[PDB]
UniProtKB/Swiss-Prot annotation, chain A:
Name the record gives this protein: COP9 signalosome complex subunit 4
Signal peptide bounds: none
GO annotation, cellular component aspect: cell junction; COP9 signalosome; cytoplasm; cytosol; nuclear speck; nucleoplasm; nucleus; synaptic vesicle
Family: Belongs to the CSN4 family.
GO function terms (MF aspect): deNEDDylase activity
UniProt main location, coarse: cytoplasm
BP GO terms, sorted: protein deneddylation; protein neddylation; regulation of protein neddylation
Subunit annotation: Component of the CSN complex, composed of COPS1/GPS1, COPS2, COPS3, COPS4, COPS5, COPS6, COPS7 (COPS7A or COPS7B), COPS8 and COPS9 isoform 1. In the complex, it probably interacts directly with COPS1, COPS2, COPS3, COPS5, COPS6, COPS7 (COPS7A or COPS7B) and COPS8. Interacts with TOR1A; the interaction is direct and associates TOR1A and SNAPIN with the CSN complex. Interacts with STON2; controls STON2 neddylation levels. Interacts with ERCC6.
Primary role: Component of the COP9 signalosome complex (CSN), a complex involved in various cellular and developmental processes. The CSN complex is an essential regulator of the ubiquitin (Ubl) conjugation pathway by mediating the deneddylation of the cullin subunits of SCF-type E3 ligase complexes, leading to decrease the Ubl ligase activity of SCF-type complexes such as SCF, CSA or DDB2. Also involved in the deneddylation of non-cullin subunits such as STON2.
Gene: COPS4
Curated annotation (Swiss-Prot), chain B:
Tissue specificity: Widely expressed.
Record's comment describing the protein's domains: The PCI domain is necessary and sufficient for the interactions with other CSN subunits of the complex. Mediates the interaction with CAPN8. The N-terminal part (1-216), which is not required for deneddylating activity and CSN complex formation, is nevertheless essential for other aspects of CSN complex function, such as repression of c-fos/FOS expression.
Subunit structure: Component of the CSN complex, composed of COPS1/GPS1, COPS2, COPS3, COPS4, COPS5, COPS6, COPS7 (COPS7A or COPS7B), COPS8 and COPS9 isoform 1. In the complex, it probably interacts directly with COPS2, COPS3, COPS4 and COPS5. Interacts directly with inositol kinase ITPK1. Interacts with CAPN8. Interacts with USP48. Interacts with ASB4; this interaction negatively regulates GPS1.
Protein name: COP9 signalosome complex subunit 1
Cellular localization per UniProt: Cytoplasm; Nucleus
Gene source species: Homo sapiens
Family that this chain belongs to: Belongs to the CSN1 family.
From Swiss-Prot, chain C:
Gene from which this protein is expressed: COPS6
A Gene Ontology BP annotation from the UniProt entry: protein deneddylation
Tissue distribution: Widely expressed.
UniProt keyword annotations, A-Z: Cytoplasm, Host-virus interaction, Nucleus, Signalosome
Location relative to the cell: Nucleus; Cytoplasm; Cytoplasm, Perinuclear region
InterPro entries for this protein: EIF3F/CSN6-like_C, JAMM/MPN+_dom, MPN, MPN_CSN6
Protein name: COP9 signalosome complex subunit 6
Protein family according to the UniProt entry: Belongs to the peptidase M67A family. CSN6 subfamily.
UniProtKB/Swiss-Prot annotation, chain F:
Family per similarity comment: Belongs to the peptidase M67A family. CSN5 subfamily.
Full protein name: COP9 signalosome complex subunit 5
Domain notes per entry: The JAMM motif is essential for the protease activity of the CSN complex resulting in deneddylation of cullins. It constitutes the catalytic center of the complex.
Lineage, broadest ranks: Eukaryota, Metazoa, Chordata, Craniata, Vertebrata
PROSITE patterns per record: MPN
Names of required cofactors: a divalent metal cation
Organism (species): Homo sapiens
Alphabetized UniProt keyword annotations: Acetylation, Cytoplasm, Cytoplasmic vesicle, Hydrolase, Metal-binding, Metalloprotease, Nucleus, Protease, Signalosome, Synapse, Zinc
Location(s) in or outside the cell: Cytoplasm, Cytosol; Nucleus; Cytoplasm, Perinuclear region; Cytoplasmic vesicle, Secretory vesicle, Synaptic vesicle
Subunit description: Component of the CSN complex, composed of COPS1/GPS1, COPS2, COPS3, COPS4, COPS5, COPS6, COPS7 (COPS7A or COPS7B), COPS8 and COPS9 isoform 1. In the complex, it probably interacts directly with COPS1, COPS2, COPS4, COPS6 and COPS7 (COPS7A or COPS7B) and COPS9 isoform 1. Interacts with COPS9 isoform 2. The CSN complex interacts with the BRISC complex. Also exists as monomeric form. Interacts with TP53, MIF, JUN, UCHL1, NCOA1, HIF1A, CDKN1B, BCL3, GFER, PGR, LHCGR, SMAD4, SMAD7, ID1, ID3, ITGB2 and TOP2A. Part of a complex consisting of RANBP9, Ran, DYRK1B and COPS5. Interacts with IFIT3.
Amino acid sequence: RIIRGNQLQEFAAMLMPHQKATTADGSSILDRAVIEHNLLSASKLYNNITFEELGALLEIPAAKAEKIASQMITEGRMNGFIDQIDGIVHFETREALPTWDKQIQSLCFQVNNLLEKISQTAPEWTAQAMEAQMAQ
Amino acid sequence: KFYESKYASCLKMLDEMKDNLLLDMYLAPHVRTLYTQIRNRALIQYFSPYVSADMHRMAAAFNTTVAALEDELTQLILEG
Amino acid sequence: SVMACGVTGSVSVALHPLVILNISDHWIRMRSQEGRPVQVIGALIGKQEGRNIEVMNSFELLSHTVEEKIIIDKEYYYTKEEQFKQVFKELEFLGWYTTGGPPDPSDIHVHKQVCEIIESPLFLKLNPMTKHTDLPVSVFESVIDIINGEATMLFAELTYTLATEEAERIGVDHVARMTATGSGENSTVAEHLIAQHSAIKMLHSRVKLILEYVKASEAGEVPFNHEILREAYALCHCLPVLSTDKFKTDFYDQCNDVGLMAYLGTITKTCNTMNQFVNKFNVLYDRQ
Amino acid sequence: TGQNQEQFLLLAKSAKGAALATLIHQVLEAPGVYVFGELLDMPNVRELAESDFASTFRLLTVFAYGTYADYLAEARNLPPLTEAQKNKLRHLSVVTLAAKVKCIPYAVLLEALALRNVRQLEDLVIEAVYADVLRGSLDQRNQRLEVDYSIGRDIQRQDLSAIARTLQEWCVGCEVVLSGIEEQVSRANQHKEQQLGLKQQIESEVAN
Amino acid sequence: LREGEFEKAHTDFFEAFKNYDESGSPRRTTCLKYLVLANMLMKSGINPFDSQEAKPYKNDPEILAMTNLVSAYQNNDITEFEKILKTNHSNIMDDPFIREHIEELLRNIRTQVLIKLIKPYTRIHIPFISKELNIDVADVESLLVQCILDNTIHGRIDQVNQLLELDHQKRGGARYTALDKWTNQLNSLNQAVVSKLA
Amino acid sequence: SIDEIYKYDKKQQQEILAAKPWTKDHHYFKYCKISALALLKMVMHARSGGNLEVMGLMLGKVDGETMIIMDSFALPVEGTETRVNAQAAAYEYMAAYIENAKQVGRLENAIGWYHSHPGYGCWLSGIDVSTQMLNQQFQEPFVAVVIDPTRTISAGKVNLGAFRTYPKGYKPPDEGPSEYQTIPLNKIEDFGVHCKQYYALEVSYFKSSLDRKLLELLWNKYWVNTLSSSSLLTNADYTTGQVFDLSEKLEQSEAQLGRGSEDKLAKATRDSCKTTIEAIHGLMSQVIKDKLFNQINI
Ligand SMILES: [Zn+2]
């Protein structure tokens, strides 16, 4: 799940001084490995988003989001692609008719879930409506 | 300059050679089919890479005018 | 009691019916060998990605008995670990299975021996001569809490969605529904729509019996329940299953494609039926 | 929900009028408890209705029936709410719109929730799915919110027929197809027995 | 090298280096410059000092200007590569056999870098690529075309918008093309059945 | 009691092994009973690899003229159909598997070998016949099974075959109808030559009591998978391919009418129906779903 930059502070306050170790650019594992997790979480929840509004969610200047997002595709940790003119990234969609098959199951399994809970909770009405199949 | 795709010069050169190459005995009777077929070839090779190309740039690049280029391409669209 | 019962979650599990049948063959065969019911034990394998876990195939494991404690002969597991890594090179070790009642001490001792092998071993248990009208196959996992100053192992139960593979689904549809001299005149549409016919019969059986409870609950006398009728409010309005301008376009996109294929296919049959007629005309009537 | 209507329902019977005037603000402002079937339908709270504790009674109906637009209409007749309660209503006010309209445009959710921008909307929707209320995704360029699944907040014994009728149309639909199959199945075999019979007449002509 | 076929220079400079290895070595210190320059411009080699006789003389502080470049070429680091040209100017840019092929070598990397950059993108600004490779827009625009001409970069240019839409839009092209054929055969088929009867 | 067959009488096997009614009559074994597990795992093994043919080993027993198949598993070999007897690569994993399997329960002996044929029917090629002839030569009671996974899907029912080869010397009797299946022309030649050298076996499918009772309890929640099935993008690269096959078969019979194997439009007509019959059947289950789940109103 996505982790905000206010829980980054919350959790940063809990840490010990030595645990915030910085390399090269002076950024922590926390402040980079965290916000990168935020993208991957946001990816499959969304299907597309602008960099301005994305960077606003992940608490960074858009330029950064755009760039690091590219890495996570490039290095091969999250499929997708970039449209720089627009300023949009496209995520794990897998949409169209494949979605239909899941949205059938999504509701069809709720029929079995609501079935089990009537067969369980009301075993009298289970025995009553039992022969509503047989007599019909 | 064809392969390097610097066409502004490529044809500039060739045009001024046409005067001498025509006077040649065996290179007179193919002075159109060659010279024109090269122009055509280059006109294809200039554009294909582009998805959208400015005609004004392509105009001076092929030693001609915008209006001329318009008709030039027109034929080539239909046929070529 | 030696199971968990708490606010679970953790991983999400799927279940292939091939796994159920490989255990079923293993129970019936080992039952038959000794002329009695047998607690057979074996290994689980399949795909593991992120949190979600699919169980694809399953095989057997060697077991002995030190006193009353079931000892998984691990030297056999490592031997079969060779041979299953060979054939299914993609697949991973996931858990194990057995038959009998619900979870109990004799399987917790075995679960410890699987815990030495891997850091997240799943556990299926099947009741062969079940009294349940439902399926007697439930999946569990290892969870550990403070039992009054004592850290100790428990079993948190989990649910299981069934597998979908089209090639597999037919295997289920063939043995669970056998053509034992039940199709004479080809028909084709009889041998296809038989699947949907009695499958939708199950859908109608379920959907109606819920609505029987809905009418009787408001009518009264049949116990009124807030926390069941609640889910029905969602269930019925959560329908209109995709009327999005995009979706139907895509649906019709497909239909037209299939239609094109029928138009060309019909021209082919016409073209043959034509040439069937042509040759018979161009020989009897015509002089070649 | 499930635990906090046994911890907070044990304390809903053994509680007077002022004990429930406090307890109503506890159960509402406590994430996980999005269902309000039991707590509103209790003999203890029904004496508070139209009494000295009537403000706290009207509030429990809003979360167990109404929406955010209804809260802003009744801003003084109800007690003042904090943001954490306004959010839980902004979750449930979408869940209602979601049950009806499954494909929601963005602008819609600025109106029914009186919100200021997408950034918020999204964030609030994040929390909605995060609290295991909804399922789905968004479409930024297209300005959409598709909803793969939503829970049902209300029980509604008022409109239990509104739940029943939608169920009947599906039961009808089940028959529509079931019989529709058996016709087409019996006809595809009949057209096979049409041709098989008609092809025996073609072959028997040759015997002459 | 002059002729272009670097596969016939590469091997030539290995054997000549070995003759200076046995006897005198006035050219051995500058002969390795042409063995390494070959392997880079061979556009494949990128493995000079791992060979045989170049192992103990890779350290040699004369040719160590070229040791920084072979890994910079191999790793495709341009800002590093061009820094070595500025500092070690006397070593590299005074030799007329390295001064000639300097830009052809710089391209071979420039393109290499660009391929990785664009891969994730579908649509991209030229002004950004300009800054990224650090180069004039026109020169980028030109270089882009060449890759497309020889057909390495799968992409096309919108000259008016100063960008690069990239090939990617992939779908079921098989169904339609396959059916196209079946449609054609039926066309020629049915006429052959008509030309039978009259 | 249904579990008459899941029993395994071991001493009865070795009396038949010595007796041999297969060295007396050349076409003795004619039937083939395939178990519940055997069918599923073989179908799963074929599709799992998918486009590529991969063979495994079957275990079973004999009874009357029926060659019963009880249990199956895979052989991690390569070059099925391209090598004569491709099981030679993993001679280790044949005996080593049965030695492990006999310790745990599978007492059944080597009964045959099975392979996948993705998108081109069930039959024995020239490479397959050379394998089976020599299999029957030494390792007797051995039956060669075939499955077509890609069509099993599109046709919508178990596409499977069980065959046995004849001797090189004695040649088969007359009684043989043999049903037609679309053979791609690239392969039609290979089939056509060695097709008459063997004979098929009458397939039948059985199940235990527990299997039967489990599958009925299983069906409580498996009806959901039937109405979200969609055999379209699943096996998209069979139907799109069969077109390429169909186009060629017409191309021949078109010129056959002209100048210049007997009327190859009658085949192509049956192929155009075969392939499209599937494509239509696909869109039956689609509209069935659009009717169901979409059309309720709010
Ligand atoms: Zn084969």
